[PDB]
Design a binder for this molecule. Structure first.
Ligand SMILES: CC(C)(COP(=O)(O)OP(=O)(O)OC[C@H]1O[C@@H](n2cnc3c(N)ncnc32)[C@H](O)[C@@H]1OP(=O)(O)O)[C@@H](O)C(=O)NCCC(=O)NCCS
Lengths: 293, 293
């Protein structure tokens, strides 16, 4: 690995041993760890243990930010084991507002989209993380999507903004996938999902409705699916839909069971870190509802 | 209708006859209209015709912005006849950069979510509309989705961000809908979609892959579907997906047919103003791809 040199910064490959004590001023800070995936580390020891772990991750490429006067404001770099290239940075309070994150982040992205021969980079910032959302924007990242997430050291889940930047954007891209479901009684299915999944009839044609759309959110666009009346008595071949939801599985589960829908049983925490339960329509279709917790 | 008073502005219900002249400094500007739904009006006469029309919209409710120094920097307000409360605004060149739009936008927004007794407001901004997305961000509007659209007075379609603000946020909201497709050879399907639909594989469980996810975009969260391998013979009931895409159907079509996919035929203009064509997987699954044009 090489070193990143910026206007007034010197980004050098992370050295858990050498960098532990310096970077502990960030990792050890509760004010800084406030938005992180885990609680501030108890000691430079723990920070060493942690930093090592982060650096080990397949794909990881982390640098330690070296200020002009030696000082180490913090680190930046690409995350380990992510699929789609993830960014990450962090600074100690004492360096906030110096445009470091922006300068270091800028270096990492720039390097990644060139010498690192990558296609694009992504940054996951929590909804209220004002300071970090600013850096992202300043760096060239633009909101791509959003996702829920739960940090074990936290009371409840939270919002995550997927902000990214590409080498060259894809003119041809897909905006949504509205899968269809052939149901017996459209009007009846609509009422069920309205209740069980808090959906709302985006539109419907026919009297009674022969075809409709169920928006799973109150907005013009977003998660949703259509319905098609089955012209017959012959049982329908089930369709398996997976719904990424926000909130706690319980709250979702509860809503669904309270809705009088057919629930397979309490929510189960799968190995890929997601609690889920399935809702089965009378036609046989299966909808599994997954939440961070 | 009531007036809205802001820190330093006065928003009075729009008056086509009275405001026409003032507002034509915006509506008559090509600089400004590049981002509007229609070409700059030829004259105050036309602007008056236009304004009157927008004002007639069922549910419309727009205000003319009046600065302390008499002037009218532009208009702002709620759009009419849009199932989901829409926001609109525009300023004449000469007033750009004074926090006007944000001041007026915030007013319209604040009002609608209180005295206007609305549940929420939306704003559809073109992805490249920097100046406008900033205003929307400042006012409190957050990205909710994305949709393509084509303006008759333009060459090709474009992307639109649906940014929203709700009076009260919904706890249990679905984030995404990942429909599953049963295929004979997962790894074969993947190769196909990657080329025909510019997809990319997110994950593939097993070797050869028995279960996988195909992301139709390069980002962490977004439109995508999973593939499940079906063991024995027997047929598979087709699953019909609908894919809202960005770009010209032709370009989309071209790519599909070129990728050697099974295409029913060239794109087709539908009544609901959308051009589409269908790709059929060997299993029989049918995926229709529609675009604004
Ligand atoms: C979007 C548009 C209104 C521009 O708004 P703006 O004038 O850029 O945004 P404001 O009106 O909130 O002015 C903000 C700017 O004024 C500055 N400003 C000056 N005095 C200010 C004050 N007292 N308070 C707040 N901001 C002030 C800000 O610093 C900011 O400068 P910055 O651009 O570098 O951020 C204009 O480009 C336009 O009319 N576009 C076409 C119509 C359109 O955008 N439609 C969108 C679809 S709904």
């Amino acid at each position: 690995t090489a070193h990143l040199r910026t206007a007034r910064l010197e980004l050098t490959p992370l050295d858990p041993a050498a960098d532990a004590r310096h970077l502990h001023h960030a990792y050890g800070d509760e004010e800084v760890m406030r938005w992180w995936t885990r609680p501030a580390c108890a000691d430079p020891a723990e920070t060493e243990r942690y930093l090592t772990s982060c650096a080990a991750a397949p794909g990881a490429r982390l640098w330690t930010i070296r200020a002009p006067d030696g000082t180490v404001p913090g680190m930046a770099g690409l995350l380990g084991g992510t699929d789609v290239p993830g960014l990450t940075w962090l600074l100690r309070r004492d360096s906030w507002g110096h445009g470091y994150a922006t300068e270091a982040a800028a270096a990492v992205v720039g390097h990644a989209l060139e010498d690192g021969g990558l296609d694009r980079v992504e940054a996951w910032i929590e909804a209220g993380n004002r300071r970090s959302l600013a850096v992202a924007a300043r760096v060239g990242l633009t909101e791509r999507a959003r996702l829920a997430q739960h940090y074990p050291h936290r009371p409840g889940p939270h919002e995550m903004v997927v902000l990214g930047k590409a080498r060259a954007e894809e003119p041809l891209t897909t905006l949504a996938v509205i899968t269809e479901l052939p149901v017996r009684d459209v009007a009846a299915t609509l009422r069920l999902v309205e209740a069980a999944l808090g959906a709302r009839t985006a539109f419907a044609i026919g009297d009674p409705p022969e075809f409709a759309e169920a928006a799973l959110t109150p907005w013009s666009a977003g998660p949703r699916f259509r319905l098609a009346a089955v012209p017959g008595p012959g049982p329908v071949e089930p369709v398996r839909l997976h719904l990424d939801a926000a909130g706690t599985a319980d709250s979702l589960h509860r809503r669904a069971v309270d809705a009088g829908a057919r629930v397979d049983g309490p929510p189960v925490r799968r190995p890929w870190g997601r609690s889920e339960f399935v809702i089965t329509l009378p036609e046989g279709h299966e909808l599994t509802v997954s939440a961070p917790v």
